[PDB]
Design an enzyme around this catalytic site. Structure first.
Site, PDB file in Angstrom:
ATOM      1  N   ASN A 166       0.902  -1.439  -0.278  1.00 36.32           N
ATOM      2  CA  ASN A 166       0.226  -0.343  -0.109  1.00 36.32           C
ATOM      3  C   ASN A 166       0.450   0.924   0.017  1.00 36.32           C
ATOM      4  O   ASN A 166       1.768   1.368  -1.007  1.00 36.32           O
ATOM      5  CB  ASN A 166      -1.024   0.241   1.424  1.00 36.32           C
ATOM      6  CG  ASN A 166      -2.262  -1.334   1.103  1.00 36.32           C
ATOM      7  OD1 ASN A 166      -3.157  -1.099   0.077  1.00 36.32           O
ATOM      8  ND2 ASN A 166      -2.348  -1.977   2.234  1.00 36.32           N
ATOM      9  N   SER A 167       0.666   2.291   0.647  1.00 35.97           N
ATOM     10  CA  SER A 167       1.236   3.590   0.919  1.00 35.97           C
ATOM     11  C   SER A 167       2.810   3.716   1.123  1.00 35.97           C
ATOM     12  O   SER A 167       3.551   4.497   0.853  1.00 35.97           O
ATOM     13  CB  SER A 167       0.732   4.509   1.969  1.00 35.97           C
ATOM     14  OG  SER A 167      -0.517   4.540   0.993  1.00 35.97           O
ATOM     15  N   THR A 168       3.454   2.547   2.128  1.00 32.45           N
ATOM     16  CA  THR A 168       4.564   1.979   1.813  1.00 32.45           C
ATOM     17  C   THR A 168       4.894   2.425   0.540  1.00 32.45           C
ATOM     18  O   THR A 168       6.251   2.714   0.484  1.00 32.45           O
ATOM     19  CB  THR A 168       4.686   1.293   2.906  1.00 32.45           C
ATOM     20  OG1 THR A 168       4.836  -0.225   2.438  1.00 32.45           O
ATOM     21  CG2 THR A 168       4.327   0.506   4.414  1.00 32.45           C
ATOM     22  N   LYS A 197       5.062   4.607  -1.156  1.00 33.21           N
ATOM     23  CA  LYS A 197       5.272   5.823  -1.807  1.00 33.21           C
ATOM     24  C   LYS A 197       7.045   5.971  -1.591  1.00 33.21           C
ATOM     25  O   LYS A 197       7.133   7.027  -2.181  1.00 33.21           O
ATOM     26  CB  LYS A 197       4.004   6.237  -1.087  1.00 33.21           C
ATOM     27  CG  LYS A 197       2.690   6.297  -1.642  1.00 33.21           C
ATOM     28  CD  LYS A 197       1.920   7.009  -0.679  1.00 33.21           C
ATOM     29  CE  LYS A 197       0.098   7.250  -1.249  1.00 33.21           C
ATOM     30  NZ  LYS A 197      -0.348   6.941  -0.503  1.00 33.21           N
TER      31      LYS A 197
END
Length: 252
Positions: A57-59, A61
């Site tokens: 997920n957002s990791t 980013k």
């Protein structure tokens, strides 16, 4: 997707110590992994669970930010992006962003605009050299968001430590600019850096992550918590991480 896409089996060629953090985890299930630069040793709670691969997920980013810096999509003088005038459910997203505010508020559209300017073949080459999880780009859309790309908790630490610590093709100014975007806390004793990740499936949390590193006056530690059940949000993975690092003496 494939037979090896959901798990990480490479043997650890290192010193490792098994931990018990089940009381801090409480009713949540998952794993915790930490690596110490000075010791060159790993410290693992729930080793079997730590080798299970999940969407970052957002990791991810973290990595889109690095690729964006590397290909000069953004830089140190300017990483601003104007808002494209679409309403989101939080007002922090409904404005202009730079790398710092986008990383802090986990602004999807900023990072999707980065990914859109990145050719698939470069990403494939980067994931290969980094050994990033299953390396599965799937449809190459938002592939890191509950989709084809998966990575284990143990790999999140190995891969982040190697990206940052090896002398590779990423520059020192890109690493420093990424670090600034990730800084969460600083006092006389430590600097704590990190990124949450939270997957949502049918209105419920299904995937929680917090991946980061601590700089103290004696050492530097890379760490990650994954949560698979209970209340598996990014926020919870962060609280558990900080509870765990505190007990180990990393935060004083």
């Amino acid at each position: 997707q494939s037979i090896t896409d959901y798990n990480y089996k490479k043997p650890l060629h290192n010193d490792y110590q098994i931990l018990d953090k089940s009381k801090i985890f409480g009713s949540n299930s998952g794993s915790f992994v930490m690596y110490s630069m000075a010791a060159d040793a790993y410290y693992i709670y729930n080793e079997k669970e730590s080798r299970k691969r999940y969407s970052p997920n957002s990791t991810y980013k973290i990595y889109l930010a690095m690729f964006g810096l590397d290909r000069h999509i953004i830089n140190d003088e300017n990483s601003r992006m104007s808002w494209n005038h679409k309403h989101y459910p939080f007002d922090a997203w409904n404005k202009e962003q730079d790398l710092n505010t986008a990383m802090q508020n986990s602004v999807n559209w900023y990072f999707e605009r980065i990914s859109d300017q990145i050719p698939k073949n470069y990403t494939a080459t980067q994931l290969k050299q980094l050994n990033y999880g299953n390396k599965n780009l799937g449809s190459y859309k938002s592939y890191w968001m509950e989709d084809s790309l998966k990575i284990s908790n143990l790999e999140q630490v190995i891969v982040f430590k190697n990206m940052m610590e090896q002398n590779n093709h990423f520059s020192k100014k890109a690493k420093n600019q990424l670090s600034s975007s990730l800084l969460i806390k600083k006092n006389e004793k430590y600097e704590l850096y990190g990124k949450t990740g939270t997957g949502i499936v049918n209105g419920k949390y299904n995937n929680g992550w917090f991946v980061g590193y601590v700089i103290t006056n004696h050492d530097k530690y890379y760490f990650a918590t994954h949560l698979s059940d209970g209340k598996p949000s990014g926020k919870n993975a962060e609280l558990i991480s900080e509870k765990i690092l505190k007990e180990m003496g990393v935060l004083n």
